[PDB]
Amino acid sequence: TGDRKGDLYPSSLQFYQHPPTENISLIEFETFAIERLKLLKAVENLGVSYVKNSEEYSKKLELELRKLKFPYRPLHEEISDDVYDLRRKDHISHFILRLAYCQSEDLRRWFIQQEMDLFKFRFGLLTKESVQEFLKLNDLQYVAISEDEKNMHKEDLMNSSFGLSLTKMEDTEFYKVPFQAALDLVRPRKVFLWRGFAFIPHKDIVSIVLNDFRAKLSKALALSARSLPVVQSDERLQPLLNHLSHSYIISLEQIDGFAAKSFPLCMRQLHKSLRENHHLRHGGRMQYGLFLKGIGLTLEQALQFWRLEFTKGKVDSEKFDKVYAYSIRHNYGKEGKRTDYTPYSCMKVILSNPPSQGDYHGCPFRHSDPELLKQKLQSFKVPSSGINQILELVKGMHYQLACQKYFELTHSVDDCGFSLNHPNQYFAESQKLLT
Amino acid sequence: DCERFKFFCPKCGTENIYDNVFDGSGLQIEPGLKRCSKPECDASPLDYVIQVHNKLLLDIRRYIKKYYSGWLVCEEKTCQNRTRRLPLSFSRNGPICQACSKATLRSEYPEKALYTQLCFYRFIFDWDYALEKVVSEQERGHLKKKLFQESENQYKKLKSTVDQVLSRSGYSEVNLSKLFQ
RNA sequence: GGAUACUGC
DNA sequence: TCACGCAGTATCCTGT
Numbered sequence: 001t002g003d004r005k006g007d008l009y010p011s012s013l014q015f016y017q018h019p020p021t022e023n024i025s026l027i028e029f030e031t032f033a034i035e036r037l038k039l040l041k042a043v044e045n046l047g048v049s050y051v052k053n054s055e056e057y058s059k060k061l062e063l064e065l066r067k068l069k070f071p072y073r074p075l076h077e078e079i080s081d082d083v084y085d086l087r088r089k090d091h092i093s094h095f096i097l098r099l100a101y102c103q104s105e106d107l108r109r110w111f112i113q114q115e116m117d118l119f120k121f122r123f124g125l126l127t128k129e130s131v132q133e134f135l136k137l138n139d140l141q142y143v144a145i146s147e148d149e150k151n152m153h154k155e156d157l158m159n160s161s162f163g164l165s166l167t168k169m170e171d172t173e174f175y176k177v178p179f180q181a182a183l184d185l186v187r188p189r190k191v192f193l194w195r196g197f198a199f200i201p202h203k204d205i206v207s208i209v210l211n212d213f214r215a216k217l218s219k220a221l222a223l224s225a226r227s228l229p230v231v232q233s234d235e236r237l238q239p240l241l242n243h244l245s246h247s248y249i250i251s252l253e254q255i256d257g258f259a260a261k262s263f264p265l266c267m268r269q270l271h272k273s274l275r276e277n278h279h280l281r282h283g284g285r286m287q288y289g290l291f292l293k294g295i296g297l298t299l300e301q302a303l304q305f306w307r308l309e310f311t312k313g314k315v316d317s318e319k320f321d322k323v324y325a326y327s328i329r330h331n332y333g334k335e336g337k338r339t340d341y342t343p344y345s346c347m348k349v350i351l352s353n354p355p356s357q358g359d360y361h362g363c364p365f366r367h368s369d370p371e372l373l374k375q376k377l378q379s380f381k382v383p384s385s386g387i388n389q390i391l392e393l394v395k396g397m398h399y400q401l402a403c404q405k406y407f408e409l410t411h412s413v414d415d416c417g418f419s420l421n422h423p424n425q426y427f428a429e430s431q432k433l434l435t
Numbered sequence: 436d437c438e439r440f441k442f443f444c445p446k447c448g449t450e451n452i453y454d455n456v457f458d459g460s461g462l463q464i465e466p467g468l469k470r471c472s473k474p475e476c477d478a479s480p481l482d483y484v485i486q487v488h489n490k491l492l493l494d495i496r497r498y499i500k501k502y503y504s505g506w507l508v509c510e511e512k513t514c515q516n517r518t519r520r521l522p523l524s525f526s527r528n529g530p531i532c533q534a535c536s537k538a539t540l541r542s543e544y545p546e547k548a549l550y551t552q553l554c555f556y557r558f559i560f561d562w563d564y565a566l567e568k569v570v571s572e573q574e575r576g577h578l579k580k581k582l583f584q585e586s587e588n589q590y591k592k593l594k595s596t597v598d599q600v601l602s603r604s605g606y607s608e609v610n611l612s613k614l615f616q
Numbered sequence: 617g618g619a620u621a622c623u624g625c
Numbered sequence: 626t627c628a629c630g631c632a633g634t635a636t637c638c639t640g641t
């Protein structure tokens with residue numbers, strides 16, 4: 001307590017309840033923000049790489065906390081000025097990051113996760129004395145049953161909880177809940193009831209503490225997102241907070257490539273029309289969406305592809321999310337009856353809605369006039385003999401055989417070796433042959 | 436969009452453009468003010484650090500003068516009216532251009548521009564930040580030894596000037612009470 | 617592509 | 626035996 005200190009920072013760990021009221025410098029603001037961003041990113045990386053109970057996790061996290069000079073260990077000496085400084089850092093940095101990490105739900109979740117992890121670690125480093133001190137300073141009042149009451153009902157608790165050993169029971173702490181909330185436990189008589197309260201078991205205490213913390217933190221983030229307009233007007237802090245998350249401290253593109261070789265002629269025609277006009281009638285939308293689902297395009301990937309393709313068609317960006325998002329979701333069984341709709345089978349495509357003027361769906365071999373099919377086959381550099389054979393097969397009403405002949409000619413294979421009965425089968429065979 | 440630090444060598448007179456604390460890669464990396472940009476020139480700008488200080492102050496004065504000139508340009512492409520006079524007639528978005536009466540006047544050199552310029556001048560002299568962020572691992576090791584302590588001290592002194600200037604800027608205190616309520 | 621609602625002027 | 630026009634926004638679904 002040198003010059004301008006106080007009792008504002010009693011303990012190392014805190015729930016970050018009271019916002020700071022000081023006037024800090026812009027340099028201090030930026031330094032604290034970046035430092036805590038580094039700390040949280042380190043926490044995330046170590047959580048991904050290691051098990052949070054592992055000793056490697058603890059060692060690396062201690063090293064990072066020491067490197068960035070954040071409070072991580074207690075000190076049974078007093079509130080030394082340096083210690084005070086560190087705690088102040090922690091307290092301000094946290095709230096700064098709150099301002100950075102409240103704009104989007106994703107961000108919020110990320111922040112919460114990292115914070116919880118850090119808090120857990122710090123709790124894990126608290127000596128029992130310190131632990132109690134903390135539990136008192138925040139009015140948590142865990143002696144959660146007291147130790148004295150636990151000894152008072154020791155035998156009852158021992159006989160209440162199934163498979164609880166004497167010493168192991170001594171190592172556990174219970175909670176008092178109104179019996180109306182423990183219905184599923186009381187009903188089969190697996191928890192002791194005393195005076196209208198059940199004594200429910202949880203090492204475990206950290207869990208309860210964390211639960212409380214998480215509740216509080218979520219609430220706080222909501223409030224911060226509600227108080228965002230006041231901060232956006234401060235240009236000084238806009239470049240930082242708006243972009244802190246992005247601060248240095250199958251692919252859609254290949255789809256076109258696939259359309260060159262693997263796509264069956266139906267999908268090739270649909271893709272050509274889509275890239276020519278950036279818009280497809282309903283039948284084409286359904287067929288192409290189901291096919292792209294079949295090849296593996298994930299819901300996010302398909303949404304991105306359709307958004308990008310349609311936006312060029314001189315339509316509002318919001319209109320896409322308003323209208324076509326539901327259809328795209330439904331094709332993947334996300335809404336409505338929520339069924340994983342399978343890709344169209346060749347029989348369905350042939351016997352599905354008959355295409356009309358302005359449409360491009362359906363099987364070209366069936367829905368294209370022989371002259372048009374001949375022209376298309378010639379365009380693809382197919383040998384004259386192959387084109388004649390394909391036309392002859394088409395005249396025989398065996399369009400599936402025509403597609404098999406197309407596959408044989410285009411892939412330079414004497415025999416297809418498979419009974420083509422699904423466009424996804426066509427694409428899979430092409431991928432197997434090429435890759 | 437910030438102008439880089441131009442310093443003319445007293446000996447050879449060739450312009451030296453400084454945009455980072457360190458120049459070069461690997462063990463060949465050294466502070467920018469250690470050697471002149473002209474290979475035939477052996478003069479070290481670190482020798483004329485008084486001149487570098489004076490040029491830095493003159494540049495800061497130039498940028499402050501640019502900001503306080505208060506030049507406004509109409510945002511309309513078909514007007515692009517340029518005036519020094521701020522009119523009292525305001526729309527919801529800001530001053531109304533008196534040439535067309537239908538578009539807003541925007542500052543040619545806003546406060547953010549000056550703040551970013553001063554921050555860049557601080558950046559091009561931030562030894563510690565460059566070591567931590569910009570510099571690599573082997574380069575950091577090569578630069579974190581002796582033979583550069585004097586350069587480090589001179590760079591700290593030069594950064595002190597920009598820090599002093601920024602301490603007097605209202606774009607240098609953050610009121611946390613106003614942010615968190 | 618379709619189906620179900622109800623506002624406006 | 627019946628029943629006014631058209632322009633526009635919002636929500637939801639597509640297996641045997």
Ligand code: SF4
Nearest residue numbers: 264266346363403423
């Ligand atoms: S036979 Fe099947 S895969 Fe081939 S073009 Fe017709 S619908 Fe497409």
Ligand SMILES: [Mg+2]
Nearest residue numbers: 281282323617
């Ligand atoms: Mg439509």
Ligand SMILES: [Zn+2]
Nearest residue numbers: 444447471476
């Ligand atoms: Zn020179």
Ligand SMILES: [Zn+2]
Nearest residue numbers: 509514532535
């Ligand atoms: Zn104008």
